[PDB]
Amino acid sequence: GPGMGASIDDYSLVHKNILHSEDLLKYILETSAYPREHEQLKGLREVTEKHEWSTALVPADEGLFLSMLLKLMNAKRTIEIGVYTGYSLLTTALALPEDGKITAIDVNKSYYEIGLPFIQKAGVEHKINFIESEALPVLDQMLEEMKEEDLYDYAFVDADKSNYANYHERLVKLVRIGGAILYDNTLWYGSVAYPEYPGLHPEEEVARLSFRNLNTFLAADPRVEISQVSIGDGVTICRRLY
Amino acid sequence: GPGMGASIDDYSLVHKNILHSEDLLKYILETSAYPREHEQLKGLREVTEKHEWSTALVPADEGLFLSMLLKLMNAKRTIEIGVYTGYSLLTTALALPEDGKITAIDVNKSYYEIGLPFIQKAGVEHKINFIESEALPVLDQMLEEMKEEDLYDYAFVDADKSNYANYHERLVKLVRIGGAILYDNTLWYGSVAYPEYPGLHPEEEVARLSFRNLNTFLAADPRVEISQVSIGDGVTICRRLY
Numbered sequence: 274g275p276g277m278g279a280s281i282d283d284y285s286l287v288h289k290n291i292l293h294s295e296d297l298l299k300y301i302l303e304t305s306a307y308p309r310e311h312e313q314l315k316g317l318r319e320v321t322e323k324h325e326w327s328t329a330l331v332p333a334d335e336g337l338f339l340s341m342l343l344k345l346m347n348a349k350r351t352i353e354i355g356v357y358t359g360y361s362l363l364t365t366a367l368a369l370p371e372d373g374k375i376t377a378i379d380v381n382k383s384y385y386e387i388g389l390p391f392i393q394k395a396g397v398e399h400k401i402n403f404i405e406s407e408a409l410p411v412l413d414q415m416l417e418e419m420k421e422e423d424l425y426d427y428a429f430v431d432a433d434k435s436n437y438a439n440y441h442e443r444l445v446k447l448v449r450i451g452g453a454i455l456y457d458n459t460l461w462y463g464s465v466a467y468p469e470y471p472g473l474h475p476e477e478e479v480a481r482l483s484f485r486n487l488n489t490f491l492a493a494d495p496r497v498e499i500s501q502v503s504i505g506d507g508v509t510i511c512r513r514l515y
Numbered sequence: 516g517p518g519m520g521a522s523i524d525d526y527s528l529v530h531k532n533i534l535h536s537e538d539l540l541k542y543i544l545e546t547s548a549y550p551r552e553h554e555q556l557k558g559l560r561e562v563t564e565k566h567e568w569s570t571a572l573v574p575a576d577e578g579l580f581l582s583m584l585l586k587l588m589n590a591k592r593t594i595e596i597g598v599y600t601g602y603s604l605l606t607t608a609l610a611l612p613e614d615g616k617i618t619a620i621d622v623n624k625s626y627y628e629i630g631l632p633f634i635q636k637a638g639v640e641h642k643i644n645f646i647e648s649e650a651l652p653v654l655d656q657m658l659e660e661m662k663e664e665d666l667y668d669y670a671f672v673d674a675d676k677s678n679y680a681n682y683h684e685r686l687v688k689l690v691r692i693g694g695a696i697l698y699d700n701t702l703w704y705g706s707v708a709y710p711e712y713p714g715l716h717p718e719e720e721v722a723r724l725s726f727r728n729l730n731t732f733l734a735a736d737p738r739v740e741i742s743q744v745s746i747g748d749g750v751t752i753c754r755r756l757y
């Protein structure tokens with residue numbers, strides 16, 4: 274994957290869309306996303322499109338959806354898990370107020386440095402505390418020091434696909450009651466729709482099975498309300514009830 | 516359409532899906548929507564599926580998305596434009612707090628009375644002020660009588676598909692700053708993706724062109740931020756800026 278393991282040349286699902294045609298996706302992006310995309314998000318996206326792991330990039334229509342959610346819920350303190358070149362992170366930082374704060378976590382700071390010049394030109398780096406680490410230890414350590422008054426409003430989870438369930442057990446305690454936890458890529462290119470799905474790299478199959486298990490679990494987890502949204506590669510929004 | 520004019524026999528787009536496969540939509544509904552769908556929403560949906568205008572029903576995964584937005588933005592006073600049998604209306608009434616208030620508007624009260632037993636059994640009918648009328652005169656009268664402190668938090672727009680642009684001009688004044696206006700069906704069965712589209716009957720084609728114009732207009736409208744979401748048949752979330 275992006276952070277470790279096999280390279281992109283052996284993956285299979287890279288170019289698969291969940292929408293019914295390339296034309297429909299292109300219509301959405303050209304009509305409703307690109308005209309509303311910040312100049313620095315455009316720049317970060319265009320440089321990322323040339324990178325070997327560009328398939329991992331959060332797309333422009335999903336980005337505006339994340340921004341909309343952040344603004345509607347008046348988020349101020351957030352956590353961003355799985356940064357890559359920083360498209361979703363820059364989206365969050367642009368949406369938050371001037372005194373908003375983001376804890377951003379990625380195992381690979383070199384990816385972050387691809388997009389960091391655009392984050393800086395947007396004038397929002399001051400909102401970001403970037404931590405280079407596997408996410409799980411950071412979440413474990415936040416749990417030990419987290420005060421109820423410091424709980425996050427919003428968490429975007431987009432790191433090791435096979436580890437979402439472990440992230441969830443920490444995050445339901447790190448976001449406030451009424452706060453949002455978003456799991457990215459929960460339809461896994463549409464491959465979750467079937468018990469079996471041939472032609473996958475072993476890492477893709479691990480992630481596919483993980484999402485099928487996670488989707489079933491979140492739908493029955495009494496601690497949250499959920500909405501799985503067929504935007505991008507699928508995004509499951511969770512809202513903490515207690 | 517459901518409110519006036521052509522019968523469903525004319526309509527050419529009813530069996531289209533914006534997602535790549537029926538199996539993926541079925542997966543979303545069975546895994547993430549139906550287990551979280553209120554029993555009275557299920558009953559209302561199942562009786563509506565047998566109705567002649569079933570194609571116009573808001574789907575269950577979109578419903579949970581509306582509920583999620585309502586709760587995340589802490590909405591308390593809303594307006595529902597285009598009720599039909601009441602699926603999105605019952606969704607809203609269940610999502611709002613006990614003292615939440617909905618102004619619901621539809622030209623056909625007989626559709627509303629199909630869903631009314633389920634709304635009553637859900638115990639949330641007290642939140643709903645139903646007005647049998649075309650929407651525009653009601654909205655215009657609201658603008659005459661509205662005060663700054665009675666602005667709506669949220670509007671769901673799902674009525675005459677050829678007239679959304681006229682609704683928008685009232686609703687950008689009726690919803691509070693920071694409030695949400697949602698336009699339903701903005702991808703119109705995917706048919707907006709092409710300038711010309713074959714074999715539609717006049718009403719479907721008028722609506723298709725209305726949505727192409729609307730999508731372009733909303734993307735350029737400085738009064739709002741937008742996010743067009745590929746859920747259901749397309750939902751465009753607008754957030755009032757000034």
Ligand SMILES: Nc1ncnc2c1ncn2[C@@H]1O[C@H](CSCC[C@H](N)C(=O)O)[C@@H](O)[C@H]1O
Nearest residue numbers: 275276330331355357361380407408432433
């Ligand atoms: N165990 C782990 N802990 C933290 N980050 C991890 C991780 N395993 C993989 N990652 C990181 O997760 C990222 C997934 S791609 C994230 C995409 C990004 N959200 C966007 O907006 O485009 C990669 O950068 C990868 O380095």
Ligand SMILES: Nc1ncnc2c1ncn2[C@@H]1O[C@H](CSCC[C@H](N)C(=O)O)[C@@H](O)[C@H]1O
Nearest residue numbers: 518572573597599602603621622649650674
């Ligand atoms: N001019 C108008 N003013 C108010 N309602 C109208 C209208 N023209 C059509 N309608 C109504 O708009 C509805 C569209 S279908 C609405 C679906 C509904 N929101 C759901 O949750 O499933 C129909 O009930 C129709 O009667």
Ligand SMILES: [Mg+2]
Nearest residue numbers: 329431457458
């Ligand atoms: Mg992702």
Ligand SMILES: [Mg+2]
Nearest residue numbers: 571673699700
């Ligand atoms: Mg509709």
